[model samples]
Each structure stands twice: as structure tokens, then as C-alpha cells.
Target chain A: PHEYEKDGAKIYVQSFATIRAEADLARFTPEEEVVVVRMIHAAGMVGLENHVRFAPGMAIAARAALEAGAPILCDARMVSEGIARARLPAKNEVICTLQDPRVPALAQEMGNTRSAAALELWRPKLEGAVVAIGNAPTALFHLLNMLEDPACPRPAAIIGCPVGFIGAAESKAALAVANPVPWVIVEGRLGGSAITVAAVNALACRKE
Target chain B: PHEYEKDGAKIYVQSFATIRAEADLARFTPEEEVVVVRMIHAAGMVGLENHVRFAPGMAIAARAALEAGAPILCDARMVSEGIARARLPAKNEVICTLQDPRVPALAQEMGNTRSAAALELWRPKLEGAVVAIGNAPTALFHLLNMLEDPACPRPAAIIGCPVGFIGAAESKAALAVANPVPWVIVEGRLGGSAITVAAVNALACRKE
Candidate 1:
């Protein structure tokens, strides 16, 4: 468990269980002041062509969230394409401009080495605004460090995107349990850029 | 019609009927010489995240060629993922790489303004070597220009691979009719990196 004090409110977060089966869902609570959960999946820097499964699962989760009383937010790629498909309301979403690491190696082979690396390097700068929004995943990581300041606002929600099988998903699980809140947990197979946005939108705007 | 002679050999290419149906296939033959044709579906790029249809069409064309007694080649992306999924042999594939314009825009957004422009400007250098290949769409453009050169060799087969839904497919169709050799065409899609090695393997070990 981890504890911190902000404006006379002492908050505690417990680490999440490793995601091996569905049984792990029992550990989170709907009654908590806030709860956060992360999904785990496979990812690779290169040479793993079949790992593109994230797109499909994310699609499923987004659809599920829309039907389950939640709205959806999309990353820039999904937002551009999803809106063309007209899946959800446009006003209830956010788009991530952060450069995902997967693109750079392809850039290098095509001789755009510098541009590739720059995409991955922009993740940190967007932290504050995300936390302020209350459901941004990157904001949770900054709570103990950057949010220690009195000015940091408490996020009402932060749903970590279901990440590929290795590092991203694993690190996210570690972060979620380490910083438990009353967050809605999205499964790994259900995590996608669009699904992530949809999950956040659903949580942010859903009627109780 | 366009005409050129390379190394004392004459080459001619012409435009023919356009194909707009959902499922249409065209064939070409180059007399007593080898020729390669590439097919790219201009309308197929939009659904990349949801389904994969354009890729299999190219693979089927390649298989049909081998059945008709003419074996052609493909670019790397087609062979590793496209041909492998199509269950066709990976032998005799060529690797093609290109500059994706999105990377530069991403870099600019990340505040790396200089890096964003470098890749867009640098990718055209690979052309015309045993390993370096040109686009199928532009083959005729080069053919007409090269006919004036004395050292250019007659094309042995139509080695074609273009990433799907771009100009690559149309380029192949144009060249197929212009040449005299029996044409072999391969299908192309996104996400493959190991196909060219297979193509080289087939070239080194062809029974003919």
C-alpha cells in the first residue's frame, strides 16, 4: 500500500494483482473513492507482425463501453478513422498526439531515423493536462512525483490502456495496483486506443 | 504507346481498359523475355484496422501465375506477411521500403521540426540494382527513359509488390500489357519485413 496527503485528505493505493485470469477482477472495488486497473498483452519493437491484435480487442471494448452507459475518447489515429466510421459522439472524446514507440523502426528503414525517435520522446510533456482531465493514464504515474504539489487536482478516473504482452502492460499493472483508486478496469484484450478513449468517456460522462 | 530500346532490345508499353469491379483480374505476356507486374488496389487502404481483403487478392494472382507456368517476384512486405498468409512460397520476393509521410508530421508535433523534414526528402535514393527495386507504377516511366541506354538488360520477369491501396497496383497493370514476357503478379498489404530474403532465395535456387 502507498499513502499520500493532499489538502488534509490522506489517500492510499494498493498494488494490483498480476493479470493471469479473470479472477483478478475481484480485487478492485466499485465502492472505493477511486480505483484503477491495467490490462496486460503482447508487444514488440520489431519482427513480431502478429502482435497487431490490439486494434481488434480495442474495437470490441469500445463497443462494449458505448452500450454500457459510457462515452468514448479516441487517440488521434483512432479519432480520425473512427469518426469517419461514425461510431460515437465527437464532443465526448480526447485524442492523444503522443508518438507511440512502434513507429520509429519503420521510419529508420525508410531513412527517416530522427523523426521516428522524436515520436516516442514526447510522452512526458502531456502529463499535467491529462491528470487535470481526471481519466488520463499517464497522470496516475505522476501522482507520487509530480502531483505532490498542492496545485495538482485529484483525478476522478484514470483507465490505463490495455498494452501489448510485455513491458507496457506489465508496467501498467504495477502502476495500477501501486496507485489504486475507484477506477473502472478495462481488460487487456479489451484495451485499444479507441476502447481506452471510450472507457474514459464512459466514466467521465456516464450517469449514475 | 511509349517506345524505348535498351541494349539493342526494343520495349513498348500502352494503356488499356480500366478495372473497377470488386473482383477482376488481368493478365499480360512479354514475348520470349521475362516481365513482372504489380497490382495495388486504390480503394482498399481505409479498412486496414478492421479487415484485410486487398492482401489476399495479390497472393491469389501470384499463385495463379505459378499455376500458369510463370513465376514472378514480390517486395519484402508482401512476401513475409502477404504471401506467407496466402500459403504461397516466399521464394523470389524483393523488399521495397518507402517514406511514410505521417512520421514527419508526428515529429513536427513533438517539437523536432528539423527531423520531421529529413525523412520526407531522403527516401528516393534506392533504385535499379540487384537488390534495389523501383515502384511498379513507375516502371514504364523508367522503361521509356532507359530504352535509350545501351547497357540496360532486358527484364527477365514482372517482379511486382506494392503496399496495397496506393498507386502500386495500377502501375503493375500498366506494365503487364506493355511487355512481351509472360507476367507474374503478386498481392501486397501492410506489415511484412522479411519477404525479400525469400525472393532472393528463390532467385538463387530456381530450377529453370
Candidate 2:
């Protein structure tokens, strides 16, 4: 008879164990630790922590917003794809407005990217919503500028990490020093939709 | 006066530059090199090459498939989100059927995951399609099994890299030995939707 190998769960356990062992995860709070671990795991980067920047109690704010039934707004379709609905405490809505019919006209009239223009549609649901930006640097920068106007709807928390050559670094740098709201962002140009999804999914399941 | 800070292009340039500098990318062919670079770039892993298992001429097959109007079949929603339509040679349809109303019933009837069940729907379009599996190990395993029947429709290329603890490793291991078609797989538990998207996106843009 062939030897029975039981390794289905071990692989997952081993992955987390290796992550915990290799990464300096003790620096973060329990909840932030979860977010960071998921971020590293999703992106497959052991040194990802070096680029991670977190505002105090950001995860708590995000989780609280979700608990309050605040919907999650994703700048990119990819960002919404990895969010596990089962992790949501309140079955909160996760919406992506990029494909909406009004976006092309809004982008053209406003002289901005379609990604940024899509955010304008989220204004009705933006109040205390969890904003996740993963693809377009323009979206992150636009949301920041929009929030600067007190008349605009405010989000509960922002998890922004847009990667690429164009405006990713500049926009994240702006978020680092100039952000007025609770936030978590990747400082450099080494982030993508996976990390954004990871951080939000991590927050969805409370470790704090 | 403030100094000129021209880092917009520099950031992206530096990213790819860093990826080229750090990763051992010489082991692959020129086309595969492009794919591995994008994979490393998207997943943020320098050592990702260790787990990469690429079949000969896989990229050519996939690109040819795209050129012939082969639509992409994504097992997960995240896999399809990152596929850039502009890079597609034929402007091939990038479809994700996870949200189809029939998926739930199919999964229930088949006693398999909803992710795997969605593949049944793809059978009609499976011939010469490029299959990308990123989230569900079951989907990858199921696809491999389905192809063995010979009666089942065959895909031109398979970019299967599902990540996680449960069945992820085993499914990939199964794919490594049992796959009957051209494939580029991340041969362990590290691959995810981002890499699947990256590989497909890279294949879409000719590097060969």
C-alpha cells in the first residue's frame, strides 16, 4: 500500500510559519501584523515590510467602517476580485465603478483618467466607505484632492498602493506626507492589486 | 529654487531595472525571460524563479492562441481583472464566468467548488483558449482531469498558478507531472492571480 500523505493544511500552515519566521512581523500590532503578513504573502516579497507605511489605528478604522456596513470602493477591478465576501462581518457591499457608463464622459469633461472619474460616481456612497486604490496613481491622487474639499464625501479609511512608472511613486509619496485621513500605503513602486486585496481582506478578518 | 525631481519614469525604470539586476532571469528564453520578469515584477518576488516551471514553446503557443482569437478563460475574477485589453493582439475577449448564475447549481450538482464548476461552462469555448488559473487549486486540478478525456475541449495554453495552503501545492504538483498541454506554472504554493495576470499580459505583448 502507498503511504498516506496528509499535507493539505500543512502547506498553508507552513507558508504562514515561514512568513512569520522570516519577516520581522513583531513591529506591528496584531491586526496590522495580519495585514502585513497577508501583504507579503500575496505579493511574495519577504522584504515588503520595508516599503509598508501604516497610519495609527488604520486597520481598526477600516474594520469599524466595515462593521458599520460601509461599502468598499475599489479603484481597479482587480482590487475587488480578491476580497473574500465571507470575511466581511456585515456582508458589506464591495463595488467597482470603473465600468459604469458615466465614466467616459466624466473623464473627458473633467480632463482626468477614467479611473479618477469613476471615483466621482462613488461620491453618493463614499461617506465612511473604505476606499481601496491599487492600480491608478491618478485615482489615489484624485481621491486625496477630492477629500481636501470638505464639501466632498469623506471616506473612513484609505488603503492605497498603485504600482507603475507614471505616477505611482509620486502619488504614494504625496499620500505619505500630505494625507489627512487614516491610511496605509506602500511607500515605493513595489505594490499591485494583490497587496491591496490582501490588506483589505486581512482587515476584514479581525486580528486586533 | 527647488531641485528638479524627475523620478516619475525613473521609478518605473528603476523597478524593472531592479528586477533585472536582482533576479536570475538568464535561465529562461527571451520570451520566457519577459514572462518571468513580469511575473517577478507583479508578485514582488526576486526568488520566484526557483518555483517557475515552464514547458518548451509555451509562450509561443499562448501568443499564437491569442493571435487566433482565443479568449482567456480565468478561473477566478482576479485573474481576468489584470489582463490589459490593449496588449491583446486580436483584442480577444477576457472572460470570467464565476459570477454566472449557473455556477452555484453546477457546483452543487458536481460536488466540487464553484470555481471548478465554472470551467464546465468554458468547455464550449475551451478549444484553443488560453486558460489562466490563479485562485482555485480545484479549478486547475479539474481542468487537467477534464483534458484527459480527449472528448473534452482542449486549450492552446495553460497559465495555471493557484496560490494558498489547501490543495494549492498538490494541484500544482499534479499539474507538473500530469499536464498534457503546454503550460507555464509556478510549481509551488507561491503563485497567485497577479502572476497569472502578469504572465498572460506579458504573453499578449510580444517579447520573442
Candidate 3:
């Protein structure tokens, strides 16, 4: 049979087969390679290993947090929508405060976008949660500011893969050095909710 | 004068500036290059013109259709949501049939995905409308099938950029030979709503 019998049946297998052939994964650690596979697959890159950067223990830290049922905090609606609840090891709460009522007023006063203001809501839940920021550079920029406050609860790990031309590059570069906690990010303007979802799902699914 | 005066003030100028310095645009035509700039910027790449592909006259066809108030028929909600309505020359309708009431039963009957089923509903408005399929390969596949019918009204142009690992490559390759109407697509499995949005917006804004 040349065709698949069921929809989505061979998707995972076929996709992974192609990834293995097209990409050079032997250079990376098993955990790191799996994240790369999904990210490259997410964006369909010719190669992504060079662009992907992470702290030494970022994968381990994110996996541990998800396994412990640490709530997943997302900076944008698309990021929250793309995460597969079925894939999570535990029934973790996926919190997104982008649509909260206070955001507009707060953003207006802060001279920043509403996305930046929404990061303030996470200060209450920042304790050991997994933060995934995929859309807004301002959200990532503002999250770092929140972490500067001593009263803020530190997240277990952060996945910063914001996509845009304006502030995306600068925001991600700042996120790269946030070694107070382990973090994962693509080091350029080339990321989105899809890439973030794959990384989060990979961590949740336990790659290594 | 340490920071900018407004939240999104420098985004356009700064982003385009980076694009100018980072990419090699001398190889492409003016129209082709602008589309390339937006797509490459959308995905963030250290590209040297490797994977982007398009049939000639596709951009002109797309731009002309948009200028004439051609409705944009998006395959995914995210695609439609990302498009800036204000940029359209006219109050053009942006149709998305993914959430239609009939989709559930139609998909069940066809044993295909709901996205494929939704394209069946596009028949009435299909004439001269611009089709932008960015999420589902099945939707793009089904669209090609619809175009085969002798009685079917053809769209003015199609942006065939369904992103995934499963059927994306095959579907786009199939679309490549669709000379009945002009088309644009990224080769391989790398594409999504953001790329589609940028392409449509570029056409709307008259980039060349």
C-alpha cells in the first residue's frame, strides 16, 4: 500500500524518519537532539542546530518541572492553544494572562504593549513553574524585569522563542544569559508558538 | 533619549533595516525579493537563498487580486486572525471555514480532516478569491482536488504553505505544477500562518 490507512497514523514516524535523514544529530546530547528535532521539524528548517542555544541543564530542568506537575505559564494565547494537554506527564495547569482585564490599563500606564503588562500576572505564579514565551518580544523583555524583583518567585525553567523583527532578537539575547535558572531559546528572530510547543511537549514527553 | 518614544515606533524601520543588511536580495526580482524578505524574516534564518520557491507572476496575481478587493480565504483560524484587516485596500472579506457547522459531518463522511472538508464550502466564493492555506496539508490537498473539476470556479491565486511533517511536502509539490492559476509556496515542511500573513500583507501594502 502506497498510502496511509489512517489519518495521522504515519505522521510521527514519517516525519521523524525525514528529520533523521536531513539533519545531523550525532553531535548533540540525546535530550538536546530531540528538542532540536522537534524545533527543526516545527519550522521545517534546513538546519537549526547552529541557531538553537540553551543552558547546560535547561532540558533536565524543564523535564523535571513538568514531571512534577509544575504549571505551564504561557505569554501568548497561541502558545497556550498549541500545547497538547494529552502529552503532559501530569495534568498541569496551563496559565495565560494575556486576556486579563487589568492588562490594557496597566500596559497603557507602562508605555509598553499589553503583552509586557501581562507578565506581571505571572509574578504570582512564578514559583517553580515552566515559562514558555513564544510570540511577543515585549513579553520576554518584561518577564526579565519581573525576575529582577527579589520578591518574585523564580520559575523552574524558561523557554524563550519569541518571533518578530523588532524586539525579538534583543529580547532573546537577554534571555540567553538568564542563568539564575536554566533556559532554552532559539538565538534569533526565527521562532513561534509551534516551536515553543514542540520544546514544551518534548520536555513533557521525556525525550532522554 | 535612552529608549524609544512609543511602544512599536521603530519596529518597521528597524526590522526592514536588518533585512537589508542580512539578506542577499540582488539575485531576485523586486517583487520576488520583497516576498523573500518577509518570509525569511518571519522564520528567522541565516539563509543564502536555498529553499524558497514560486511560480512566476504569482506575486503580481496576488497583488492585483487584493487590490481588486478579492476576499482572502484562509485555511486556518490562526492565519485569518494574524492578517491585518486595516491594510486591505477595500473592506475585503477574510473567510475561514474551519469552524463551520457543516465541517464535522463532512469530515466524518470523507474520512479526511475537517480542514479538507471546509474547502468544499469555499466553492461558492472560490471565484477570484485568494486562497491562503497555512496549517493543514489536507486542506491544500483537497483544494487541488476541487480545482480538478471542470465546472469549478478557479481562485485568482493560491498561497500553498501548509506547515507540517506528514503531507506538507507532497501537497506543496503537487501544487507546484498547478499552472491553472499562479501560486507561491516554501519548499519542504517549513511554513505556517505567520508566513502566510506576511505574504498577504506584503501584497496588500504594494511592496514593489
Q: What does candidate 2's lDDT look like per residue over A72-119, in tens digits?
A: 999888888778888898989999999999898888787777888899
User: How displaced is residue B105 in candidate 2, in Å?
Assistant: 5.6
Pairs that collide, model 3: none
- Winning model by lDDT: 2
Q: For residue B95, what is the lDDT in candidate 1?
A: 30
Measured on C-alpha atoms, candidate 3 has an lDDT of 0.80
- Model 1 vs truth, CA RMSD: 22.1
Query: Higher-TM-score candidate among 1 and 2?
Result: 2
Q: Compute fnat per model.
A: 0.00, 0.24, 0.39
Tens digits of per-residue lDDT for model 1 on A85-173?
23343333333332455654644553432222332332443232221111222222333233345454433233454322212333245
Find the candidate with the highest DockQ and give its number: 3
- Residues B64-145, model 3: lDDT tens digits: 8889989999997768866777689888899998889989898889897877888889888999999998878878877877
Ranked by DockQ, top first: 3, 2, 1
Worst-scoring 10-residue span by lDDT in model 1 chain A: A3-12
Pick by TM-score: which candidate is best?
Answer: 3
Grade the docking of candidate 1. Answer: incorrect
The candidates, ranked best first by TM-score, are: 3, 2, 1
Collision pairs in model 2:
none
| Alpha-carbon local distance difference test for all models | 0.29, 0.81, 0.80
Off by over 4 Å in 1: A1-76, A79-93, A99-154, A187-190, A200-208, B1-208
